[PDB]
Paper text:
Among them, one gene codes for a eugenol oxidase (EUGO) that displays significant sequence identity with VAO (≈40 %) and a similar but not fully overlapping pattern of substrate preferences. In addition to the oxidation of vanillyl alcohol and the hydroxylation of eugenol, EUGO can efficiently catalyze the dehydrogenation of various phenolic ketones and the selective oxidation of a racemic secondary alcohol—4‐(1‐hydroxyethyl)‐2‐methoxyphenol. The overall structure of EUGO is highly similar to that of VAO, as indicated by a 1.1 Å rmsd for 490 Cα atom pairs (45 % sequence identity). As predicted, EUGO also shares with VAO the presence of a characteristic covalent bond between His390 (equivalent to His422 of VAO) and the C8M atom of the flavin ring.
Incubation of eugenol (1) with the enzyme in Tris⋅HCl buffer (pH 8.0) containing 1 % (v/v) DMSO afforded coniferyl alcohol (2) with complete conversion after 4 h at room temperature. The structural bases of substrate and inhibitor binding by the cavity were explored by solving the crystal structures of EUGO in complexes with isoeugenol (inhibitor), coniferyl alcohol (2, reaction product and inhibitor), and vanillin (4, reaction product); these were obtained by crystal soaking, resulting in highly defined electron density maps. All these ligands bind with their aromatic moiety stacking against the pyrimidine ring of the flavin and the Cα atom of the aliphatic substituent lying right above the flavin N5 atom at a distance of 3.2 Å. In this orientation, the ligand 4‐hydroxy group is H‐bonded to Tyr91 and Tyr471 and is also in close contact with Arg472 (3.5 Å). These three residues are involved in the stabilization of the phenolate form of the substrate and are strictly conserved in VAO. Collectively, these features are fully consistent with the substrate being bound in the phenolic form and oxidized through a reaction mechanism involving a hydride transfer from the Cα to the flavin N5, coupled to the stabilization of a p‐quinone methide intermediate as demonstrated for VAO.
Residue numbers in the entry:
A (entry chain B), B (entry chain A): 2 to 526
The structure:
C-alpha cells in the first residue's frame, strides 16, 4: 500500500511529483516501492514499519532546492533533507515523519567548491564524502588533513549538521564549521557569516559575521536545507604515532577516566580525541559473536575472558594518537605511560608493535586519527546475522564515577533485554560522548522491538540520573527532547516558536529533534 | 524635556516606572536627567544628541528580570539590557533606541555562582567583571586563568554577548562560552545546552545539548536578557614570555602579516592572540598628541619619526606571548625571531629586556596575555582633551595585501577627516579583527560629526571592497547591517522574522545590530 504525505491524496501527490520532475528531471525523482526500499532505515528499530518515505528528489543546484521547497509549500508536502543519507544508528536516510519526501542533496550537489591551502579550509556541497575529500587532498598533494568519523562514506556536511564527531584535534566538526548556505523553509536562500557580505573572501575565515549568530540553529534542526558549508582543515603534522592501552578489568573504567582528565583538558599530552572502547566493541570489529559464545543470552564471563585472551586486549582499550616532531611525541608518550601505568594490568602498544588480529582496531584508529578514512568498522555489523546498530549516546562528565555509573546503568538494561553493550567513550576536553552501540539482528521483529523498548527505557533512566543524549535515532527524538524540559519545556517551546515563524506551512523535516510544526503538534506520529 | 519611550505618554511612563519600582525597589530605578547623565554614551558620536535612555532599572534576580519584561510588554516600553554597560567605543551603556529603559543587570546580579577547578569553568552572573573574577581566582589560589580584554572593568558576560575578544589562547570569548540562561522577550526563562536537562552537571561541560543550538542567537542580539552564562577557563601554564617586534616602515605591514600566517594557523609557535599595533596606538597609550605635534591637521612624517625615535618603537609593533615549559618557549621564540627577522629593520624585545616608557605597552600586554586585567589602556583617551574613541572594526583575511589595502583605505579617510588612525590588528587563526580606533575630542560638535560621517563612509567603502565589520557602534548598526545584504537582504529578513516571533510587542533593544521589530521598522528611530 502506497506511502503518501499526511493528508495529501494520491492525485495531489502525483501532481507534485510531476512538478518536482519539471525542476530536477525525471531520472532524479524516485517514487516506486522498489526504488524506495533503499531509503528505508537499514537498521530498523521497533517491530512495526516506521519512517517510510513517499519519494526521493535529487536536486543538482541551490535554485532547484528553492523550487522544490516552493512546490512543497504549495502542496503541503513535508521534505526531509539529507546529504548522503548515511546516518545509520540514527535512522539512515529515513524521515522522522512517514510520508515525507527525502531531498537527497548529495546525489548531485557533490562538488568540492574550494580547498584553500593557504588558509586551511574547504567549501563543500553536501555530497562530498570523506573519501571524496581525502582523494582530492591526496591528488593535489595537499598539506591539509581532514577529520573523519569511523566510517568515511558519509558527508563532511551531513555529519557536521548532526554535530557528529571525529578523532583528530579537529574532531568537533561543528566547532570547525565556518559559513553556510541554506534554503529556508519557504524557499528563500541565505548565507551566514561573512558570506552575507557580497564579495567577501572571508566566508570560511571568520564564522560569526555581524549580528545574531545563527549557524548552530541549522544543526540537529529542521529550519532549512543546507546547500553549501565551509569547514576549517588542519595542517598535517610532520609525524604521528598511535597507541593502545589495554586495561584488564571492567572495574578499571573509573581510574582510567580520572587519570585521563588532567592529561587531556589542556590538549596535551593527549592531543587527539582519545577513545575508550570495551572488549565488545573491539571483538565485534574483528570477529563474530559465535566465535566466543553460541547462546541467545548474555555472554558468560569465561567467554569474555577468552575474547580478551585470544585478541590480547583488555576489557577497556584506550586508543590515542600523538602528533608533532618525534622528540615531542616521545615526551608526550612518556607522560601517558607514566600516568596510565599506575593502573595494575595496563599494557601499552604503539601502532608499530601489533600485527595480530586484536591489533586491527589500533591500525584502523591510526588511519582515522590521521584523517585517512576507512570502512573497516562496518565489520561490527557481522557480529550477528543481518546486523544492525542503534546509537544510544549520553554525554558524560569526564569523571570516572560518572562513567562507571552510566556503564553500569546501560549494562544492566542491556542484559535485561538481551543485547550486547559495545561502548565507545569519545573524549572531548571537558566532556565525553558515551556512545553505546547495540548490535542486533534486524530481521527478527522481537529483536527490533526489544531494541526500541530497551532504548526508550535507557533515555528515561539516564534523564532521571541527570544525563542527556547528544544525538539520537528517529525513534527516540520525541523521548530525548522530552528530557530537556527544564522550566516546563522552555527549550522546546522556544524551538517551536522559531519553527512556526520560519515554516508556517510545516514543510521541513517535521519532528526532527522532537520539533513539530503547528499542524502536526498533539498527534501520534 | 523628558526623554520618553516612543508612543508612550508621560502619564503611562510614570505608571510603568512605579511598577518597575514595585519589582526592584525605589532606590533601583533611576529616572532624573541628573541620574541618567552617567548612562549617556561617554564617547558620543554625531553632533546631534542621540541614544538617550528614559530610565535605568537594576534588578536583583532572574525573577525580577522576568517581572520587568512582563511590565514592559504591558506598557509597550522598550528595554535595553546591559551587563556592566562599559561598551565604550560602541555606545557605552546608551541604548540604540532613544527612550528605551536600560536594564542594568550587572549592578546587583554580580555573583560568581561557581568556579570549578577540576573541569575548568565558571558560571557567572552579568555583573562579574574581569577584575572580580581575577580576584576570586587569586584569593582561592586557583590553577585557572581568565581571558580578558584590554580593560578589566567590563563584564565576562557582557563582553561575550557582544562577541568581544581577548588575547590568551582562550581569546575568542564566544567560543568558550558554555551554557546560558536567558529571559525571552515575553518573560519566559530558558536555559541552553545541557542546562535544559534538569539536574545535569554538564551545563558548562558540553555546549550543544540536543536539537538546534541557539546560544549564538543571543550574541549581538535583541532576543532576550541573559541572566547567567558559563565560560571555560584555561589552566595557567607553568611559564610564559611576552615579546615585542618593532618594524620601522608603514609599508612593512604586508610582509609582517604574510610571515605571520604560517606561524599562527597551527597555534604554534604563535600560541596566543598576537596584536599588531601602529605607533599612534602605542604613542597614545603613553603620551599626549601635543608632545609630538601641535599644529593643524594630520601629524606630519617628521613628527611621526619623532614618536618612533623617542619611544624606541616602530610604525608597527607586534606583541605576542608564549606559554609552556621553558625549553618550549625558547624553541618557539627562536622560530619567531628567525621568521620575522627577514624584514629589514625588525627589532625584538622580550618582557624581561625592556622597562622604558616605550616598553610600557609590552608590560601591559604581558599582564593581559597572562589573564591579569588592567586599566592602563584608558590612557589612550588622554591623547587629546576630552578624549573618546569609536571602533571601526573590519574583518581582514590574514593576508598582507588585504591588510595593507584596509590600512591605506582607512588612512586616506582618517587624513581627509582629520582624525588620527590608531590600528590594532587582533590575529586569530584564519582571520584578523582590524580594530581602527579613532581618538577624538568629544566636546567639539565638529569632531563628533566628522567621526560619524567618516565612519559611515568607511563602512560603505569597506563593503564596496568586500570587507565587513565584526562589531559596531550604535550609530553605525543600521549601516553595517545594510552591508550584509547578500541575496537581497536575506540575512536581515531572517533576523526580523525571528525577532517578530519572539518579541511580538517589540520590547527588547530595538535596533540592535540593525534589527528593528515590526512596530519600529521604517521610522528612522
Ligand atoms: C553504524 C555506525 C555509525 C557511526 C559510526 C560507526 C558505526 C559502525 N561512527 C561514527 C563516528 O565516529 N562519528 C560520527 O559522527 N558518527 C558515527 N556514526 C553515525 C553516522 O554513520 C555518521 O555520523 C554519518 O557520517 C552520518 O551520515 P551522513 O554523513 O550521510 O549525514 P546524512 O545522513 O546526510 O545527514 C544527517 C542528518 O543531518 C541533517 N542534514 C543532512 N544534510 C542536510 C542538509 N543538506 N540540509 C539540512 N539538514 C541536513 C538531517 O537531519 C540528516 O538526517
Ligand atoms: C575604549 C576601549 C574599548 C575596548 C578596548 C580598549 C579601549 C581603549 N579593548 C577591547 C578589547 O581588547 N576587547 C574587546 O572585546 N573590547 C574592547 N573594547 C570595547 C569594550 O570596552 C569591551 O568590549 C567591554 O568589555 C564591553 O563592555 P561590557 O563588558 O560592560 O559589556 P556591556 O556594555 O554590559 O554589554 C555589551 C552589549 O552586550 C549586550 N548585553 C550585555 N549584557 C547583556 C544581557 N545581560 N542580556 C542581553 N544582552 C546583553 C548588549 O547589546 C550590550 O550593549
Ligand atoms: C551511531 O553513532 C555514533 C557512533 C560512533 C562510533 C562508534 C564506533 O565505531 C560515534 C559517534 C556516534 O554518534
Ligand atoms: C573599541 O573596540 C575594540 C577595541 C579593542 C582594543 C583596543 C586597544 O586598546 C579591541 C577590540 C575592539 O572591538
Amino acid at each position: 500500500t502506497r506511502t503518501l504525505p499526511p493528508g495529501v491524496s494520491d492525485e495531489r501527490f502525483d501532481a507534485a511529483l510531476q512538478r518536482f520532475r519539471d525542476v530536477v528531471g525525471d531520472k532524479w525523482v524516485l517514487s516506486t516501492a522498489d526504488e524506495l526500499e533503499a531509503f528505508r532505515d537499514p537498521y530498523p528499530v521497533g517491530a512495526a514499519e516506521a519512517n517510510l518515505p513517499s519519494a526521493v528528489v535529487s536536486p543538482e543546484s541551490t535554485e532547484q532546492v528553492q523550487d522544490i521547497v516552493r512546490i512543497a509549500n504549495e502542496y503541503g508536502i513535508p521534505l526531509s533533507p539529507v546529504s548522503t543519507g548515511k546516518n545509520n544508528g540514527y535512522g539512515g536516510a529515513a524521515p522522522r515523519l512517514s510520508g515525507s519526501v527525502i531531498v537527497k542533496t548529495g546525489e548531485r550537489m557533490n562538488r568540492i567548491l574550494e580547498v584553500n591551502e593557504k588558509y586551511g579550509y574547504a567549501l563543500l556541497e553536501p555530497g562530498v564524502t570523506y573519501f571524496d575529500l581525502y582523494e582530492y587532498l591526496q591528488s593535489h598533494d595537499s598539506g591539509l588533513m581532514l577529520d573523519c568519523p569511523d566510517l568515511g562514506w558519509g558527508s563532511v556536511v551531513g555529519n557536521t549538521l548532526d554535530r557528529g564527531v571525529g578523532y583528530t584535534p579537529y574532531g568537533d566538526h561543528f566547532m570547525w564549521q565556518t559559513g553556510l548556505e541554506v534554503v529556508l523553509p519557504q524557499g528563500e536562500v541565505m548565507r551566514t557569516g561573512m558570506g552575507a557580505l557580497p564579495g567577501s573572501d572571508a566566508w570560511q575565515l571568520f564564522p560569526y559575521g555581524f549580528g545574531p549568530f545563527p549557524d548552530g540553529m541549522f544543526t540537529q534542526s529542521n529550519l532549512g536545507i543546507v546547500t553549501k558549508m565551509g569547514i576549517a582543515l588542519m595542517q598535517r603534522p610532520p609525524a604521528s604515532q598511535s597507541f593502545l592501552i589495554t586495561f584488564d578489568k571492567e572495574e578499571d573504567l573509573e581510574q582510567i577516566v580520572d587519570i585521563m582528565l588532567p592529561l587531556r583538558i589542556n590538549m596535551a599530552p593527549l592531543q587527539n580525541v582519545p577513545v575508550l572502547r570495551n572488549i565488545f566493541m573491539d571483538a565485534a570489529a574483528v570477529s563474530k559473536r559465535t566465535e566466543w559464545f553460541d547462546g541467545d543470552g548474555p555472554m558468560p564471563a569465561e567467554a569474555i575472558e577468552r575474547m580478551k585472551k585470544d585478541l590480547d586486549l583488555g576489557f577497556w582499550n584506550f586508543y590515542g594518537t600523538l602528533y608533532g616532531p618525534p622528540p615531542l611525541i616521545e615526551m608526550y608518550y612518556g607522560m601517558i605511560k607514566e600516568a596510565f601505568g599506575k593502573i595494575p594490568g595496563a599494557r601499552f602498544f604503539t601502532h608499530e608493535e601489533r600485527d595480530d588480529r586484536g591489533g586491527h582496531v589500533l591500525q584502523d584508529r591510526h588511519k582515522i586519527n590521521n584523517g585517512i578514512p576507512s570502512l573497516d568498522e562496518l565489520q561490527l555489523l557481522d557480529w550477528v546475522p543481518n546486523g544492525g546498530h542503534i546509537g544510544f549516546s549520553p554525554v558524560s562528565a569526564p569523571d570516572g564515577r560518572e562513567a562507571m555509573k552510566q556503564f553500569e546503568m546501560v549494562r544492566n538494561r542491556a542484559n535485561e533485554y538481551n543485547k550486547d553493550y559495545a561502548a565507545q567513550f569519545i573524549i572531548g576536553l571537558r566532556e565525553m560522548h558515551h556512545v553505546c552501540l547495540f548490535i542486533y539482528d534486524t530481521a527478527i521483529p522481537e529483536a527490533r522491538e526489544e531494541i526500541l523498548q530497551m532504548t526508550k527505557v535507557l533515555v528515561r533512566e539516564a534523564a532521571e540520573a541527570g544525563y542527556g543524549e547528544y544525538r539520537t535515532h528517529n525513534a527516540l527524538m520525541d523521548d530525548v527532547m522530552a528530557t530537556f524540559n527544564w522550566g516546563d519545556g522552555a527549550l522546546l517551546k522556544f524551538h517551536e516558536k522559531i519553527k512556526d515563524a520560519l515554516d508556517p506551512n510545516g514543510i521541513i523535516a517535521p519532528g526532527k529533534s522532537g520539533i513539530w510544526s503547528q499542524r502536526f503538534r498533539g498527534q501520534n506520529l
